[PDB]
Design a protein around this ligand. Sequence first.
Ligand SMILES: *C1O[C@H](CO)[C@@H](O[C@@H]2O[C@@H](C)[C@H](O)[C@@H](O)[C@H]2O)[C@H](O)[C@@H]1O[C@H]1O[C@H](C(=O)O)[C@@H](O[C@@H]2O[C@H](CO)[C@@H](O[C@H]3O[C@@H](C)[C@@H](O[C@@H]4O[C@H](CO)[C@H](O)[C@H](O[C@@H]5O[C@H](CO)[C@H](O)[C@H](O)[C@H]5NC(C)=O)[C@H]4NC(C)=O)[C@@H](O)[C@@H]3O)[C@H](O)[C@H]2O)[C@H](O)[C@H]1O
Ligand SMILES: *C1O[C@H](CO)[C@@H](O[C@@H]2O[C@@H](C)[C@H](O)[C@@H](O)[C@H]2O)[C@H](O)[C@@H]1O[C@H]1O[C@H](C(=O)O)[C@@H](O[C@@H]2O[C@H](CO)[C@@H](O[C@H]3O[C@@H](C)[C@@H](O[C@@H]4O[C@H](CO)[C@H](O)[C@H](O[C@@H]5O[C@H](CO)[C@H](O)[C@H](O)[C@H]5NC(C)=O)[C@H]4NC(C)=O)[C@@H](O)[C@@H]3O)[C@H](O)[C@H]2O)[C@H](O)[C@H]1O
Ligand SMILES: *[C@H]1O[C@H](CO)[C@@H](O[C@@H]2O[C@@H](C)[C@H](O)[C@@H](O)[C@H]2O)[C@H](O)[C@@H]1O[C@H]1O[C@H](C(=O)O)[C@@H](O[C@@H]2O[C@H](CO)[C@@H](O[C@H]3O[C@@H](C)[C@@H](O[C@@H]4O[C@H](CO)[C@H](O)[C@H](O[C@@H]5O[C@H](CO)[C@H](O)[C@H](O)[C@H]5NC(C)=O)[C@H]4NC(C)=O)[C@@H](O)[C@@H]3O)[C@H](O)[C@H]2O)[C@H](O)[C@H]1O
Ligand SMILES: *[C@H]1O[C@H](CO)[C@@H](O[C@@H]2O[C@@H](C)[C@H](O)[C@@H](O)[C@H]2O)[C@H](O)[C@@H]1O[C@H]1O[C@H](C(=O)O)[C@@H](O[C@@H]2O[C@H](CO)[C@@H](O[C@H]3O[C@@H](C)[C@@H](O[C@@H]4O[C@H](CO)[C@H](O)[C@H](O[C@@H]5O[C@H](CO)[C@H](O)[C@H](O)[C@H]5NC(C)=O)[C@H]4NC(C)=O)[C@@H](O)[C@@H]3O)[C@H](O)[C@H]2O)[C@H](O)[C@H]1O
Ligand SMILES: *[C@H]1O[C@H](CO)[C@@H](O)[C@H](O)[C@@H]1O
Ligand SMILES: *[C@H]1O[C@H](CO)[C@@H](O)[C@H](O)[C@@H]1O
Ligand SMILES: [Ca+2]
Ligand SMILES: [Ca+2]
Lengths: 254, 254, 437, 437
Amino acid sequence: LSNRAQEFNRRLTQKTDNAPWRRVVYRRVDLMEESNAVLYYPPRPIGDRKNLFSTIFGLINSNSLDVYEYLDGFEAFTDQYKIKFQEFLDRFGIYYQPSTNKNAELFKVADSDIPSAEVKAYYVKEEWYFTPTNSDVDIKIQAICPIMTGQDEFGEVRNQPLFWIPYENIRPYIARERVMLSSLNNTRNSTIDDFFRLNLYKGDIVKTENLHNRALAEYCPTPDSMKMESKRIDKELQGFRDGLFVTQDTTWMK
Amino acid sequence: LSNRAQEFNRRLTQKTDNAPWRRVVYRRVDLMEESNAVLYYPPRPIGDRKNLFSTIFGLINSNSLDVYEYLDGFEAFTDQYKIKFQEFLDRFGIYYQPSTNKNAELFKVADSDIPSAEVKAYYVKEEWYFTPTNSDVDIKIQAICPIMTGQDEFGEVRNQPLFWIPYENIRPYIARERVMLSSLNNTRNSTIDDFFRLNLYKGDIVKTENLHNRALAEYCPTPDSMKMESKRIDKELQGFRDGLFVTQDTTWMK
Amino acid sequence: EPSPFGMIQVPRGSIVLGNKEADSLWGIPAESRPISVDAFWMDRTEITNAQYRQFVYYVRDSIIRERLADPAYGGNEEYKITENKFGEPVTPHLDWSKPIPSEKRATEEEIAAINSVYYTNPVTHDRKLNPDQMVYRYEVYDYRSAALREHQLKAAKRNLNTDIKVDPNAVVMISKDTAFVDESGNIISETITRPLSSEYDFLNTYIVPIYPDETCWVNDFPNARTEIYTRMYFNHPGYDDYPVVGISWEQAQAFCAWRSEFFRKGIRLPEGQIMDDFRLPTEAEWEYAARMGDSNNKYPWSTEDLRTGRGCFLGNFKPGEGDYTADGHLIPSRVSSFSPNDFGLYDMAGNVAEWTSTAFSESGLKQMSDINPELEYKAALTDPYILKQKVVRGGSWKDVARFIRSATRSHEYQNVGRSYIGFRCVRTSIAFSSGKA
Amino acid sequence: EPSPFGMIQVPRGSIVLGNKEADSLWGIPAESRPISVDAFWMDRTEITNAQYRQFVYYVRDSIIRERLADPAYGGNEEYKITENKFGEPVTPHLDWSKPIPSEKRATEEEIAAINSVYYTNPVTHDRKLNPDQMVYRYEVYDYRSAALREHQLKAAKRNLNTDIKVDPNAVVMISKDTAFVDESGNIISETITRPLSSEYDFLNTYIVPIYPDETCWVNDFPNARTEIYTRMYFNHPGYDDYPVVGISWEQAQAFCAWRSEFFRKGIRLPEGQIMDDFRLPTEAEWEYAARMGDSNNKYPWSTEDLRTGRGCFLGNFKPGEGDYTADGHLIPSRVSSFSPNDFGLYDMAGNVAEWTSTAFSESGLKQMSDINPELEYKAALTDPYILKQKVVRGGSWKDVARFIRSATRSHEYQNVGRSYIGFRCVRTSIAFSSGKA
Ligand SMILES: *C1O[C@H](CO)[C@@H](O[C@@H]2O[C@@H](C)[C@H](O)[C@@H](O)[C@H]2O)[C@H](O)[C@@H]1O[C@H]1O[C@H](C(=O)O)[C@@H](O[C@@H]2O[C@H](CO)[C@@H](O[C@H]3O[C@@H](C)[C@@H](O[C@@H]4O[C@H](CO)[C@H](O)[C@H](O[C@@H]5O[C@H](CO)[C@H](O)[C@H](O)[C@H]5NC(C)=O)[C@H]4NC(C)=O)[C@@H](O)[C@@H]3O)[C@H](O)[C@H]2O)[C@H](O)[C@H]1O
Ligand SMILES: *C1O[C@H](CO)[C@@H](O[C@@H]2O[C@@H](C)[C@H](O)[C@@H](O)[C@H]2O)[C@H](O)[C@@H]1O[C@H]1O[C@H](C(=O)O)[C@@H](O[C@@H]2O[C@H](CO)[C@@H](O[C@H]3O[C@@H](C)[C@@H](O[C@@H]4O[C@H](CO)[C@H](O)[C@H](O[C@@H]5O[C@H](CO)[C@H](O)[C@H](O)[C@H]5NC(C)=O)[C@H]4NC(C)=O)[C@@H](O)[C@@H]3O)[C@H](O)[C@H]2O)[C@H](O)[C@H]1O
Ligand SMILES: *[C@H]1O[C@H](CO)[C@@H](O[C@@H]2O[C@@H](C)[C@H](O)[C@@H](O)[C@H]2O)[C@H](O)[C@@H]1O[C@H]1O[C@H](C(=O)O)[C@@H](O[C@@H]2O[C@H](CO)[C@@H](O[C@H]3O[C@@H](C)[C@@H](O[C@@H]4O[C@H](CO)[C@H](O)[C@H](O[C@@H]5O[C@H](CO)[C@H](O)[C@H](O)[C@H]5NC(C)=O)[C@H]4NC(C)=O)[C@@H](O)[C@@H]3O)[C@H](O)[C@H]2O)[C@H](O)[C@H]1O
Ligand SMILES: *[C@H]1O[C@H](CO)[C@@H](O[C@@H]2O[C@@H](C)[C@H](O)[C@@H](O)[C@H]2O)[C@H](O)[C@@H]1O[C@H]1O[C@H](C(=O)O)[C@@H](O[C@@H]2O[C@H](CO)[C@@H](O[C@H]3O[C@@H](C)[C@@H](O[C@@H]4O[C@H](CO)[C@H](O)[C@H](O[C@@H]5O[C@H](CO)[C@H](O)[C@H](O)[C@H]5NC(C)=O)[C@H]4NC(C)=O)[C@@H](O)[C@@H]3O)[C@H](O)[C@H]2O)[C@H](O)[C@H]1O
Ligand SMILES: *[C@H]1O[C@H](CO)[C@@H](O)[C@H](O)[C@@H]1O
Ligand SMILES: *[C@H]1O[C@H](CO)[C@@H](O)[C@H](O)[C@@H]1O
Ligand SMILES: [Ca+2]
Ligand SMILES: [Ca+2]
């Protein structure tokens, strides 16, 4: 908000436009794991104990946030391609009952109407990018999905991706909320922005931005195929990082 | 557009009119291969993520491009032999619904009406030519086909070649679009003009400009005959290049 | 070579800058990334009470010099007025070649001017220096922000991409904090967000009280008696070789600036020209100077254990639970008490935790560069107090062995000054090392 | 023989000019084609701060010479007026045999003229050379484009094919960029597309500021402190044998032209006649001079590994992740620090990446000729910024071992000047080598 704060934030952005590496990879991360489980909080605000879905819902409800929608296979971020809250509510038949505030918001948060409890995984788009100045491999987050992991009769994930949150837009509304991170410490010392920036959403890669625009589902249907493909992608990026190593044979033993 | 740009482009053309080699060869290249798969992008413009077919369709729709048609065995490039967009649309019964723009275009792009997704191979005419000045074997691209690789009941290619794109005409509209090239890098650093100029459309030769005007289909119907004939042509051009080698016995070993 | 006394030339090198394995009990990610730093001069001992006492003596000297220079409080009018020797009408800021003020014998006006900054206790009749009138005024130049592309003076020079035409009416916002003094004596620090118009938009003037917060010995230690500590930790003549505590980060910057000023005034050398001044050490610089630039060095000693072969303890931290004096010392011990690391730095991890320049963000390592990295956030006035959180490192006497490990970040507010926060003044060395390793 | 000092005569030869195998992880085609180049003189060391400082001293000298030559700013009127000795009314551009201007003692007008180009800091009171008034003006002749068939003066000589009659009203478009100076002092560079009418359509006049962008040390390194670098990398007397950085490609051409002018002025030799001048090295020329003209030489050292037998590092690149100083140096090290290749070129792959003449097109190798190949694109004003992309090669201190391999193209904008972009001035050698290999 302050001029110095804006200057620091601008100096803090990752200017990636001319880099000889722009590998964009899509990762599904399970909240069941202890690392990502910071997203299993009660939907109600109750002060500051909120998950991501609750605060995104609260921000989009007040029309203070600009967000985009899904495309079922592609990801086009266009100004005309804007998600409509009517389409958001008709996804599960949520009533309108417009509020008298109007300017503050048009739809009242109906307590537990948001499916914060039944979302169990997160989609993330991470762009591993080289740097033309300091030659350090880094990551830039731009998009995520709170995939609707519903529970039907046979237990299938039955995912209906609600919409596409651009990280740049939600960043101002995440850099302030500083919820607890690790259960064995239970300290309010790291913001959720620090959680995303520090690359702690350990999960498995669903598919990269391949030329064929394919996914891991095209491979063997067995889940072990998904695990082996995710580990293959992970070790291939690890090998890309290792290819810059020039510090071999440092044992100095005879 | 600029005078210096036009001068550089003119200095960049390959003046091949008097060369003691003009071997014109026709190659079918499969987009299923990772090398050529830069042509499996969504048909819609959505900014700049487009394949070749989409941009050729967009350019011919606005009448800003001059293109020719097929001949089913021959390739005659004549001014009077001009492809008509009415024949383009009646190939698959595409409606007209003329637009009010008129000067901008006469037919509105009906989203997924272009068969960008179901084209799976490319025809290319490449002229391997010697040079009378620097004696370097080079290639000059002049014509291509987005062969309509349809899927009938029995899975036959059922190709209907739409038309014949001259490379010189499409070059100005390709030198600007600079889509990503290799999936393991995902960087927007090379234009599609660089893709064609650098000879990366690795495929198989369908037929040369033989005296009999024949094709590989006249040989044994088995696909292995096609593979062996394509490899024979490839090694014969490789031997033509090797015939100029005067640097044998450089091992200097005893 | 200048080679300042009390300094050690730490060479350039690289450090992993963190700890890979994480204490599950502590529940921290323990993030790390390699970082390389250049060579610089670091003072071996934490700045003791003697050095900061010299600083406060200097500021008191010129304070009373100015007060006696006022016509209403003595009117000595020494200064330097026009026709200085060879007809030089120089600006008369202050005169320092004048005879030193004399105690006991003086005129009434001189005694009144001297006592104007002294403070006598109504109930105790003890005279000391006034904490709210021991103010240091200095100026710093934001060299890094002045050379930025978007902060260049000429608008057409703010964008080297010729595709987009440069608008002469560019709306760029600058920041500048220049505490100015008023007629009432209440020093008011203000921030200005005027549009970039001239070079003056890149100079920051700071006037801050510099007397250490002795009360720190009491405020952060409730239900404990520290009368023998807050009373004369600074004032005791025997407490000279002990590091000073209670220093606010602002006072740390002020003292480093004063050290730079003293170095510039003394040893006249036109060859130095734009030779680098003193500053607080950065987070990466401090950690590299601590762990010897070695990945395997968890602590700033060769071995991985906190006990030597004979069981002796290195560094006056808290060894055991409620066992502050197991090592041998309870409060911040005297400098150079323990065996130094071969890098030449005394009490590298121990004694008092160190002020460092880089602002804490909890991103930190994963948000700065790889060459001499540091974060600069000169937050001004109307900012949230969270953003005014300078990071500290080193581990103090109160902190357990976990915090004595060099690769441990820790919060600290720049405004507050605690009884366990020392600091160092560090300078950049322009050394033409031939290498040839 | 002239044999310029600091030069090395690299002979003619051939090079594969690329790398056959491709790093799958990097995902590049790794295209290559053989190319042969002739012999030429290449300077062994990257042009240091001393040489560019000599250039800026020269341009400052004549700048103040012209300012004092103005009647309004001193009116010394030395110049050279009509009846020069033996009645020669030569053109009075500038006088350089006049007595050198004297510091301290002078008239008021002379001091004002000298200070007209100097710049004093309002807040720091430091005087240096004005970046926007250290402008070099030179002229180049487009010999290659003047001799083209379609660019011949006579229309009938533009087509040797007599089948088609030559139209006297031929509509041919020429290009010429001649930055002219205006009365306001704002140097404006313009392009002209007048039809070919005379020989003047083939001469390009360029006036460009030549003071290095010291701010490059800050703009491309955010969240890192480089105050000790941007302040006096050029200005430090000890930083003389270190390569200069921050030079724009335009300034590189200007400096090479100045070196040619100095070579022409000194050593009077009518036998030279049209003897070749200095220029930037071409992409193929640079790579051939790097890899010794050997296919198996991935890097400019005999072995294929970056470590010697004893483990020492050659070239001050970035060896490890965040390990800039593993080789021994962090910033651009001093020239000739490492063991040179036997071709006689110091720091051939390392230190600072090199400016090269050929414009990057991503076609490159597969679009130029086979004899002394290079691409010429003197883009002017109203062109897309993409086309103004001069290629660079060499690998710098910041770049990993992958970019230190000589057969690696890399983007660079001609306008910008970064803290890792040095350059070389190279000349063509007219050598009558007998061969007999
Ligand atoms: C923090 O900020 C506090 C508030 O500003 C300030 O407190 C104030 O002062 C306390 C001492 C006191 O308690 C109160 O007064 C209090 O309010 C603190 O001291 C502290 O200040 C620090 O930052 C300030 C800031 O930038 O905000 C600094 O102020 C700067 O002072 C400079 C020197 O006085 C100013 O420079 C010149 O600026 C120009 C506009 C001058 O105005 C005239 O312009 C005419 C048209 O051009 C004349 O031709 C002539 O032009 C200038 O001439 C001089 C000749 O030397 C210049 O070199 C240039 O040639 C030319 N300037 C231009 C426009 O290019 C000028 N005539 C005069 C009067 O000389 C004039 O205003 C200044 O000379 C600067 O603008 C100002 O921001 C402060 O120094 C610093 O300590
Ligand atoms: C970049 O371009 C900027 C814009 O042009 C220029 O800036 C301008 O100058 C700055 C110093 C100042 O700030 C502003 O004025 C600014 O606008 C920069 O300096 C810079 O210029 C560079 O490129 C220019 C360019 O080509 O655009 C160069 O200009 C050229 O200058 C030459 C010398 O002045 C010109 O040559 C002659 O051209 C002919 C047409 C002359 O005109 C008369 O023609 C009559 C009919 O023939 C007369 O008979 C006689 O003919 C000529 O006589 C001379 C005798 O020496 C010739 O040798 C020939 O015999 C004959 N020419 C022909 C037609 O064959 C001429 N009478 C006169 C006046 O002598 C006359 O105009 C010139 O002598 C050339 O045309 C012009 O393009 C610039 O030199 C260069 O630095
Ligand atoms: C003591 O400290 C208190 C806490 O800060 C302060 O209290 C504050 O003010 C009270 C009123 C208030 O009650 C308090 O609440 C609180 O706000 C006190 O006021 C007092 O500090 C004050 O006085 C100090 C003092 O004078 O002792 C000030 O420190 C001095 O500041 C000077 C300038 O600000 C420094 O001088 C430097 O800059 C110039 C002026 C140089 O001095 C001469 O300049 C001449 C021209 O004017 C000569 O040309 C020559 O300059 C040379 O120029 C060449 C180039 O040509 C070089 O580049 C150098 O600039 C210089 N060369 C050298 C080496 O001499 C100089 N020679 C002469 C004739 O003396 C120069 O000496 C310095 O660079 C001075 O160093 C510094 O001690 C303090 O700022 C002020 O607050
Ligand atoms: C310093 O640099 C600043 C940055 O460039 C510049 O600032 C710019 O201008 C400011 C006004 C502005 O404020 C700035 O923003 C910026 O735009 C400064 O102005 C200044 O540069 C300027 O002055 C320089 C200077 O004079 O020092 C200029 O460089 C000089 O240019 C001369 C010509 O342009 C060069 O001379 C060559 O060409 C001719 C003139 C030769 O000189 C004599 O010519 C006579 C006839 O006129 C004689 O015949 C004889 O010529 C001989 O002819 C035979 C054939 O018969 C040979 O072929 C040769 O031509 C020659 N023989 C020899 C070896 O002498 C010459 N002898 C005499 C009597 O002197 C010749 O000497 C040169 O070839 C000169 O070398 C060069 O230094 C700079 O161009 C200008 O911008
Ligand atoms: C450290 O803590 C983890 C859980 O955080 C346990 O596996 C075990 O206590 C370990 O020592
Ligand atoms: C290089 O990369 C290819 C894929 O690009 C793999 O076959 C393997 O990783 C190889 O080393
Ligand atoms: Ca202790
Ligand atoms: Ca190095």
